[PDB]
């Protein structure tokens, strides 16, 4: 009375083939890593690219490592980062290189689109924030610089659906990842004519975005048994939020990682000028529920520092950070200066000086700066979101790799004056599986899955502390 589901979770730095076991009886769900592999940007001669073919191998290796282990597979599901896509010709052959979002080809195009179509028109048609590397600008870039490829393009597939195509031979256009392109109209749930027109892309290159849950096709294991491949909320962040144990309208989530996200769920999107000024985005989620969110910096800051100072002990570091007072060193984590400087330590330090503050030079102080600044940014963003929807939040759910940092978790609670529930850490993978289980008819909906999660995953509550240094700080600057 059990079902085994495979989740293919791919990130910008790594990929994973996870196997989950759902025991309907006990209402229990367990994870288990089957195979890991590296992912990374490559520079194929002036171009920044993804080695899709190496990723296809690694996925197949793990799919196969499971079948060789005599384990029965009920369904497969792939989720990845968004925005990126792979072009195919009618013969099913790749057309050109799989250009990453981190390429420079789109420089200047975002600003051009706003001048030509209109900031508000683009925003009100798609409800998606303006990120310099959105699919829209990448497609415009594709047609403005590679005129030759255009006639050979028959299909454009978002990264998650491509790998699904390699496994099944069937094509798909998953809704949630689809909305990240800034090419989908918020009222029809279909590609926006006027935006595809500006991009230069062809509508025949895409098909009606279809909501998550459909069986894209089949994959055949070493023998011949057919394993169904399901379209899950392919955008990793949509999967992460699905698995966030939300309960109610007063709850918020913060997808904590290298890059982070903070938002809430809503029946309708926010496209007013307020939402526009605050850089808010209305991403597509499961059940037609929008993920009204805002892209936030994240731990990439600490990563670069742990890396530059050759720090191998994350703990001890957290321990040492705590001997230091807080809110002595404050920077703005969302400032462009932190996207990619040659020296992250020199940049934090420069920032602190520009604001007549003392300079954080030790490891502890650098970590102290990052953390206090993040919690403060988080608390500010949460405040933006409450002001947008019209009402405070009662709980903050932190999921992903970053929900493990208890020092950051207690700081967010103290800074937000809001209760924080951390977990689960495998948010993206869990959400992937959740949708699969809904398709296998094991669970009825997201809330049903979230309940499984709230009891399955060991969640951690962090209570706000009004006597905390960071709490005092917020209070007096307010």
UniProtKB/Swiss-Prot annotation:
* Record's catalysed reaction(s): L-rhamnulose + ATP = L-rhamnulose 1-phosphate + ADP + H(+)
Reported cofactor(s): Mg(2+)
State where ATP binds.
12-16, 258, 303, 401
Q: In which pathway does it act?
A: Carbohydrate degradation; L-rhamnose degradation; glycerone phosphate from L-rhamnose: step 2/3
Q: Report the EC number(s), separated by commas if there are several.
A: 2.7.1.5
Disulphides: 67-221, 352-369, 412-416
UniProt key word Kinase:
yes
Domain of life where this protein originates: Bacteria
Q: Which Pfam families has this protein been placed in?
A: FGGY_C, FGGY_N
The record's top EC class is transferase
Any one GO MF term held by the record is: glycerol kinase activity
Cellular component annotations (GO), alphabetically ordered: cytosol
- GO biological process terms on file: glycerol metabolic process; rhamnose catabolic process
Give the record's keywords alphabetically.
Answer: ATP-binding, Disulfide bond, Kinase, Magnesium, Nucleotide-binding, Rhamnose metabolism, Transferase
**Entry annotation: catalytic residues:** 236
Residues annotated to bind substrate:
82, 235-237, 295
**Matching SUPFAM superfamilies:** Actin-like ATPase domain
| Assembly | Monomer.
Similarity remark: Belongs to the rhamnulokinase family.
Described by its record, this protein's role is as follows: Involved in the catabolism of L-rhamnose (6-deoxy-L-mannose). Catalyzes the transfer of the gamma-phosphate group from ATP to the 1-hydroxyl group of L-rhamnulose to yield L-rhamnulose 1-phosphate.
The record's PANTHER family line, in alphabetical order, gives:
L-RHAMNULOKINASE (PTHR10196:SF93), SUGAR KINASE (PTHR10196)
Descriptive protein name: Rhamnulokinase
* Species name: Escherichia coli O157:H7
């Amino acid at each position: 009375t059990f079902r085994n589901c495979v989740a293919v979770d791919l990130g910008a730095s790594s990929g994973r083939v996870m196997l989950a076991r759902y025991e309907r009886e006990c209402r229990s769900l367990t994870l288990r890593e089957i195979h890991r592999f590296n992912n990374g940007l490559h520079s194929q001669n002036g171009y920044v690219t993804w080695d899709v073919d190496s990723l296809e191998s690694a996925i197949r290796l793990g799919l196969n490592k499971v079948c060789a282990a005599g384990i029965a597979i009920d369904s497969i599901g792939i989720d990845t980062w968004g925005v990126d896509f792979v072009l195919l010709d009618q013969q099913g052959q790749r057309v050109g290189l799989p250009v990453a979002y981190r390429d420079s080809r789109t420089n200047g195009l975002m600003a051009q689109a706003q001048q030509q179509l209109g900031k508000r028109d683009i925003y009100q048609r798609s409800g998606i924030q303006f990120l310099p590397f959105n699919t829209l600008y990448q497609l415009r870039a594709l047609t403005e610089q590679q005129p030759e490829l255009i006639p050979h393009i028959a299909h454009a597939l978002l990264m998650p659906d491509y790998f699904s195509y390699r496994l099944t031979g069937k094509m798909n256009w998953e809704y949630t990842n689809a909305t990240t392109t800034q090419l989908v109209n918020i009222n029809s749930d279909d590609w926006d004519e006027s935006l595809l027109a500006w991009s230069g892309a062809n509508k025949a290159w895409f098909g009606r975005p279809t909501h998550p849950g459909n069986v894209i096709g089949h994959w055949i294991c070493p023998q011949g048994n057919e394993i169904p491949v399901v379209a899950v909320a392919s955008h990793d962040t949509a999967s992460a939020v699905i698995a966030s144990p939300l309960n109610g309208s007063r709850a918020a989530y913060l997808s904590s990682g290298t890059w982070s996200l903070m938002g809430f769920e809503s029946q309708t999107p926010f496209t007013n000028d307020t939402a526009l000024a605050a850089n808010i985005t209305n991403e597509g989620g499961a059940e037609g529920r929008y993920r009204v969110l805002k892209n936030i910096m994240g731990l990439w800051l600490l990563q670069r520092v742990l890396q530059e100072r050759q720090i191998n002990d994350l703990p001890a570091l957290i321990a040492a950070t705590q001997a230091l007072p807080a809110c002595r060193f404050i920077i703005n984590p969302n400032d462009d200066r932190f996207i990619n400087p040659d020296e992250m330590c020199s940049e934090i330090q420069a920032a602190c000086r520009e604001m007549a503050q003392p300079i954080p030079e030790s490891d502890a102080e650098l970590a102290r700066c990052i953390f206090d600044s993040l919690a403060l940014l988080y608390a500010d963003v949460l405040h933006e979101l409450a002001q947008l929807r019209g009402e405070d939040f009662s709980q903050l759910h932190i999921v992903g790799g970053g929900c493990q940092n208890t020092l950051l978790n207690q700081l967010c609670a103290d800074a937000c004056g809001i209760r924080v529930i951390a977990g689960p850490v495998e948010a993206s993978t869990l959400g992937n599986i959740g949708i699969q289980l809904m398709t296998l008819d094991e669970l009825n909906n997201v809330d049903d899955f979230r309940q499984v999660v709230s009891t399955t995953a060991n969640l951690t509550t962090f209570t706000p502390n009004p006597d905390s240094e960071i709490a005092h700080y917020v209070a007096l600057i307010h």
